[PDB]
Amino acid sequence: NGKQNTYFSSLDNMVAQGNVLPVLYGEMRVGSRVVSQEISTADEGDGGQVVVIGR
């Protein structure tokens, strides 16, 4: 609409095919080039031994 973009920032998760990785030089908050993205079902438990499904 009226947003001004520069050549040295990106806050968006851009497509990562044929797109060069990038280069970051100190500080800054950055977007990314998504290498993988997978929505699945998590498996119960974190670590150790004790696991409880429901309480």
Partner: protein, 232 residues
């Protein structure tokens, strides 16, 4: 202010100065050739000019377009040489038209040349007095039965380069085979067509995933084996 000695600046300001000779060197070692030393003139004894103990052979050669500027295009000099008797031709058909070679240019006052070049000797000889410049050969612009012309460029010349360079790809490796990033050092396994070979001269990676697997180097694969489906 160029790092040039005090004797050269003493000679520059004199009203009546000696001749300023230019000595050229062509270095094709990095591309597969030798080093040739040229000077447009002989000395008073009709011999190739001896400078710092090195003999620069007589051969017609001269350059132009030499300047130091920052605003605009990078300066591209030009070196014109004689192609009588087919010398440069021989180098053009041999060393890929001399492309990629290094041209070194030295400016030297004749007063400081070695005592060999003069009949009476040179008490003022000082082999440290020279002004050096380096350039690369970009294109043999002309090559006829008479002469040859070369375009020179600064060794930096960021013309065709891009930044950043590494590219995201799937089903292809962007690393250099057996390079540091590739990290492979094993024996010969296969060629670029994934055909099993034990010959070290026919051992190149196909740059595909199977080529990487042939060498158990998949951890070092330069590609990204998930991005082909996220771009749909």
């Amino acid at each position: 202010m160029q790092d040039i000695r005090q004797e050269t600046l003493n000679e520059c300001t004199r009203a009546e100065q000696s001749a300023s000779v230019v000595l050229w060197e062509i270095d094709l070692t990095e591309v597969g050739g030798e080093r040739y030393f040229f000077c447009n003139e002989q000395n008073e004894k009709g011999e190739p000019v001896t400078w710092q103990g090195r003999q620069y052979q007589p051969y017609p050669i001269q350059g132009s377009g030499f300047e130091l500027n920052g605003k605009g295009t990078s300066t591209r000099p030009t070196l014109t040489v004689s192609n009588l008797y087919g010398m440069v031709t021989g180098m053009a058909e041999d060393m890929q038209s001399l492309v990629g070679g290094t041209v070194v240019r030295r400016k030297v006052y004749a007063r400081f040349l070695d005592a060999v070049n003069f009949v009476n000797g040179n008490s003022y000889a000082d082999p440290e007095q020279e002004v050096i410049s380096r350039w690369r050969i970009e294109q043999c612009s002309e090559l006829s039965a008479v002469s040859a012309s070369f375009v020179l460029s600064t060794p930096t010349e960021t013309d065709g380069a891009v930044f950043p360079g590494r590219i995201m790809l799937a089903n292809t490796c962007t690393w250099t085979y057996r390079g540091d990033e590739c990290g492979y050092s094993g024996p010969a396994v296969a060629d670029e067509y994934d055909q099993p070979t034990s010959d070290i001269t026919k051992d190149k990676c196909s740059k595909c995933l199977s080529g990487c697997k042939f060498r158990n180097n998949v951890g070092n694969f330069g590609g990204f084996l998930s991005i082909n489906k996220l771009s749909q």
